Design a protein around this ligand. Structure first.
Ligand SMILES: Cc1ccc(C(N)=O)cn1
Length: 167
C-alpha cells in the first residue's frame, strides 16, 4: 500500500490522475518525483518551471552546480538530484523536444529511466511544451515502464481524452 489517492488504474503498474504535479508532490512527498527536464537543466516553464518555482529556485541552483561539474545530459537520459520540499529525490528525465526536432524514438529510452525506481510520481514525457502527442507518450509509458508510475495530467480536457482513448 502507498499514499497516492484518486488515481484511475490503467494497467498492472500504471495509474493516472487529473492533478497539478506540484500540488500532488507537496501532498504525497513521494520518494521520486520526475521532472520534464532539458539537457541543460534550465527549468524555465512547464513541469520544470513549475517544480522549480515551488522549490523557491533551489532546484535551479542545485542543477547549475550539477551541469558545471558534469556537462549536459543526453536526450533520453536522466540524473537523480534532490527533491527539495517536494519529494526525497527528483529524477530529471529528458524526453525528446519535437519543437527542437529531436527523434521521437528517444521517448522509449527516456521512459526506461523510470525502471530504476520502484515507485514514481511523473508527468507524461515529451507532452506539453515538448510538442509530442500525449496519447503516444502514454502508450510508450505503458509499454516501457515496469515499475509503479503515478501519472499527473494537468489539463482536465487532456486527462479525459487520455482515459477515453486508452487501449
Ligand atoms: C503552474 C503549473 C503547474 C503544472 C504545470 C504542468 N504540469 O505543465 C504547469 N504549470
Amino acid at each position: 500500500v502507498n499514499s497516492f489517492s484518486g488515481y484511475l488504474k490503467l494497467t498492472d503498474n500504471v495509474y493516472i490522475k487529473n492533478a497539478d504535479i506540484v500540488e500532488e508532490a507537496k501532498k504525497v512527498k513521494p520518494t521520486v518525483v520526475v521532472n520534464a527536464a532539458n539537457v541543460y537543466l534550465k527549468h524555465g516553464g512547464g513541469v520544470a518551471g513549475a517544480l522549480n518555482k515551488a522549490t523557491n529556485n533551489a532546484m535551479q541552483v542545485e542543477s547549475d552546480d550539477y551541469i558545471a561539474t558534469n556537462g549536459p545530459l543526453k536526450v533520453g537520459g536522466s540524473c537523480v538530484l534532490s527533491g527539495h520540499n517536494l519529494a526525497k529525490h527528483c529524477l530529471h528525465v529528458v524526453g525528446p523536444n519535437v519543437n527542437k526536432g529531436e527523434d521521437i524514438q528517444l521517448l522509449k529510452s527516456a521512459y526506461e529511466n523510470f525502471n530504476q525506481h520502484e515507485v514514481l510520481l511523473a508527468p507524461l514525457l515529451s507532452a506539453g511544451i515538448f510538442g509530442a502527442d500525449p496519447i503516444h507518450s502514454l502508450r510508450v509509458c505503458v509499454d516501457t515502464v515496469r515499475t509503479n508510475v503515478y501519472l499527473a495530467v494537468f489539463d482536465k480536457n487532456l486527462y479525459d481524452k487520455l482515459v477515453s482513448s486508452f487501449l
